[PDB]
Design a protein around this ligand. Sequence first.
Ligand SMILES: *C(=O)N1CCCC[C@@H]1c1ccccc1
Length: 224
Amino acid sequence: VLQRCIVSPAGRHSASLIFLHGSGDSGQGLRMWIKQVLNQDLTFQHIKIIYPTAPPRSYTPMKGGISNVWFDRFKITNDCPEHLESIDVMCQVLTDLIDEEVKSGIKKNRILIGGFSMGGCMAMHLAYRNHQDVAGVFALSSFLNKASAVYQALQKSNGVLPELFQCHGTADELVLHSWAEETNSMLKSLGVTTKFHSFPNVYHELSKTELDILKLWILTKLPG
Ligand SMILES: *C(=O)N1CCCC[C@@H]1c1ccccc1
């Protein structure tokens, strides 16, 4: 079962935020990173924050070395196929996490999924392929590979889709800004309502302005 860090709401629990860490991190590591960036913990009045940890597994860009990665990648580029087999395994594990939140009494339309780097890619696969009834999706410094299963699923979709909140730093040398912009343009052309925030002088990192406007957007999607 997934290990996790739970940041409670201040009052009665009525919504949930599943926040997925980037490659090589952990749920507690991301929570602590956000705490450092904001100079205090990210908390809400009625939204519970769930920071699960990717189980350690082989990671091909690390030459098969073990890392806390949600899924595998052949190479760091958007120009190669995505590794669907590892993505689908993690989609099932994270569906069990969403189902335990629903079982606890939270409607799927009161759950927001998102992440940083790999976590954002994982959140997009979850929301647009299996859980189109979530309140929304957010991706921080993330991208989808060309010919993604997300695009094929959206091509075959007809309903209302979860809104995407996407942020990227223009100077990011790990996830190129062009890969994140292409992903956002692709999703928009496929019928997804999106907000794309481009941060100049921001690299592959979390910024205080980015987290402040993300918090404001989460509150519009999960009102008290
Ligand atoms: C984020 O989690 N990342 C892992 C998948 C590829 C994009 C990004 C990354 C790129 C290069 C080096 C480390 C992380």
